[PDB]
């Protein structure tokens, strides 16, 4: 269990607004569509039997909710999901921070990115992501309840995008999924 905290993932950002009084238009709409229970369970956007095959278990149009009815409100095809403007530091990497509320032996954290031109009014599909991840982390250390992971960012990517993070356990077939709304500078 967990989700991305740096930058905040889509589900965790809405939880942090306060499920009883969402502020952003998108988080209000998510609560209207699927209830507060999705936000209370922000750390549980999983598929139990992924086993490294995520397209088997996460349908197109439902990536951010991982194909789960509980999380359908995360799938709204809106341009206003709150985003974080990101850039690498002077090392050339960006430091992701994952809040690991139930730490587990890890096979990988994979990071996918939306294709150039992706229109957020289109429901998010796997084919809207480049087929190969831009960053694949196979070794993580638990530090203060988190994984701090250094990734290069996708080169030449501009504007508002979705990073789709996949955490595959190595001790279980279960995986966790975090859409992360970001923007890249020119
Ligand atoms: Cl720096």
| CA 85 to centroid of ligand 1, rounded, Å | 15
β-strands 84-86, 175-184 pairing: parallel
What is the rounded CA–CA span in Å between residue 108 and residue 121? 30
Chain-centroid distance, C-alpha 128: 14
What is the rounded CA–CA span in Å between residue 1 and residue 104? 8
* Host domain of residue 48: 1-186
Handedness of CA 17, 23, 24, 26 (dihedral sign): positive
Task: Give this entry's resolution in angstroms.
Answer: 0.8
- Cα torsion 67, 109, 174, 82 to 10°: value is -30
Instruction: Tell me the technique behind this structure.
Output: X-ray
| CA 88 to centroid of ligand 1, rounded, Å | 8
| CA 75 to centroid of ligand 1, rounded, Å | 34
Handedness of CA 46, 50, 54, 59 (dihedral sign): negative
Q: Are 74 and 122 in contact (CB under 8 A)?
A: no
| CA 124 to centroid of ligand 1, rounded, Å | 32
Query: What DSSP assignment string belongs to 21-73?
Result: S--SHHHHHHHHHH-THHHHTGGG-EETT-TT--TTTS-TT-TTTTT-GGGGG
- Length of the chain in terms of residues written: 186
Q: How many domains does the chain have?
A: 1
Nearest C-alpha neighbor of 172 from the set 79, 54, 47: 47
Nearest C-alpha neighbor of 102 from the set 68, 142, 140, 136: 142
The 10 Å Cβ neighbour count of residue 41 is 16
| CA 174 to centroid of ligand 1, rounded, Å | 35
What is the DSSP secondary structure assignment for residue 123, as one 8-state letter? P
Residue 73: what are its φ and ψ, rounded to 5°? Answer: -60, -20
| CA 89 to centroid of ligand 1, rounded, Å | 4
The 10 Å Cβ neighbour count of residue 102 is 9
| CA 11 to centroid of ligand 1, rounded, Å | 28
Q: Indicate the helix (H) or strand (E) that contains 15.
A: helix 10-17
What is the rounded CA–CA span in Å between residue 66 and residue 46? 7
Q: Specify which residues 142 forms β-bridges with.
A: 147
What is the rounded CA–CA span in Å between residue 23 and residue 116? 29
| CA 157 to centroid of ligand 1, rounded, Å | 20
> Which residues are close to ligand 1, an ion, with C-beta < 5 A?
89-90
Q: Tell me how far CA of residue 17 lies from CA of 1, 25, 26, 46, in angstroms.
A: 20, 11, 11, 22
Q: Are 184 and 172 in contact (CB under 8 A)?
A: no
Residue 140: what are its φ and ψ, rounded to 5°? Answer: -130, 150
What is the rounded CA–CA span in Å between residue 127 and residue 118? 10
């Amino acid at each position: 269990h967990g989700s991305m905290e740096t930058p905040p993932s889509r589900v965790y950002g809405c939880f942090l607004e306060g499920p009883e009084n969402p502020k952003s238009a998108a988080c209000k709409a998510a609560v209207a569509a699927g209830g507060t229970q999705a936000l209370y369970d922000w750390n549980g956007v999983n598929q139990g039997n992924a086993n490294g095959n995520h397209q088997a278990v996460v349908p197109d149009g439902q990536l951010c909710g991982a194909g789960k009815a509980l999380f359908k409100g995360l799938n709204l095809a809106r341009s206003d999901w709150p985003s974080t403007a990101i850039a690498p530091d002077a090392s050339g990497n960006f430091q992701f921070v994952y809040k690991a509320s139930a730490p587990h032996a890890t096979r990988y954290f994979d990071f996918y990115i939306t294709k150039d031109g992706y229109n957020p009014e289109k429901p998010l599909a796997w084919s809207d992501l480049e087929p190969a991840p831009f960053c694949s982390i196979t070794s993580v250390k638990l530090e203060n309840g988190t994984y701090r992971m250094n990734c290069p960012l996708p080169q030449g990517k501009t504007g508002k995008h979705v990073i789709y993070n996949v955490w595959q356990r190595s001790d279980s077939p279960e995986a966790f999924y975090a859409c992360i709304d970001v923007s890249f500078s020119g």
